């Protein structure tokens, strides 16, 4: 038996919302230290790594480690049936045939119970090496999200240019070109740690998927170096993080 309970269930709703459009299937690694999830998208250009620590839960219990093949659209469909205030419970047994999700309402005269089948997955996992990064940018997650949406009107690739001044986001297409410049502020702050200037290029399509995690974190961090994948990081407060990795273009 494996049991995880989260009194603020919205956390989980937001996670599924942050994953379900990018990847269809995935394996949940259940361990006494918390939950890990990792997957590539079909095109293998991006990756998403999810960590949720034991101690961010209100009740965590794991006798055996487990790896659960999950259809994530299915799981999202289920969590849609949860209210924002519901206490959410995840449960798996000895047998691990199905995964159960239990929603208790603060109304508490209502209890919902859902059980999804666990499909069998060839889980093409990757190893994320520890790098250090030429440039590292911290900014409000909605601001980054608006940058990404705005430039999708213009072109399909964004060029991120980081010097000590600040980072510049650029895209071009038939209409013309757009450039957005952020500088460092006197949270809602913009901070830029630059050890050596970078100029990189990424598919905006993928970024617009990443920004689905905006409601999970007020702040987003971007980590870049020449010739290593971009890291987009959202921190789940008190519990873990959601990291997205993206391969540059050309």
């Amino acid at each position: 038996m494996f049991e995880a309970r989260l009194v603020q269930g919205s956390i989980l709703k937001k996670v599924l919302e942050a994953l379900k459009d990018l990847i269809n299937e995935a394996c949940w690694d259940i361990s006494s230290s918390g939950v890990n999830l990792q997957s590539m998208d079909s095109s293998h250009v991006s990756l998403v790594q999810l960590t949720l620590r034991s101690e961010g839960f209100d009740t965590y219990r794991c006798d055996r480690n487990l790896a659960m093949g999950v259809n994530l659209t299915s799981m999202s469909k289920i969590l849609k049936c949860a209210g924002n205030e519901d206490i959410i419970t995840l449960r798996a047994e000895d047998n691990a045939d199905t995964l159960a999700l239990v929603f208790e309402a603060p109304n508490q005269e209502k209890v919902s119970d859902y059980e999804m089948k666990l499909m069998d997955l060839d889980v093409e996992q990757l190893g994320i090496p520890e790098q250090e990064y030429s440039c590292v940018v911290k900014m409000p997650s909605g601001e980054f999200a608006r940058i990404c949406r705005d430039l999708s009107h213009i072109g399909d690739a964004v060029v991120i240019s980081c010097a000590k001044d600040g980072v510049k986001f650029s895209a071009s297409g038939e209409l013309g070109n757009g450039n957005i410049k952020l500088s460092q502020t006197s949270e809602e702050a913009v901070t830029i740690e630059m050890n050596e200037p970078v100029q990189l290029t990424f598919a905006l399509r993928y970024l617009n998927f990443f920004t689905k995690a905006t409601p999970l974190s007020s702040t987003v961090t971007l980590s870049m170096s020449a010739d290593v994948p971009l890291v987009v990081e959202y921190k789940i407060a008190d519990m873990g993080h959601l990291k997205y990795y993206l391969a540059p273009k050309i």
């Binding site: 095109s43 250009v45 994320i128 598919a203 994948p229 391969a247």
Partner: peptide, 14 residues
């Protein structure tokens, strides 16, 4: 245009 895959950068730990 050309899109690089994460294979060029990350090892396959399966």
């Amino acid at each position: 245009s050309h899109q690089n895959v994460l294979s060029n950068y990350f090892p396959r730990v399966s």
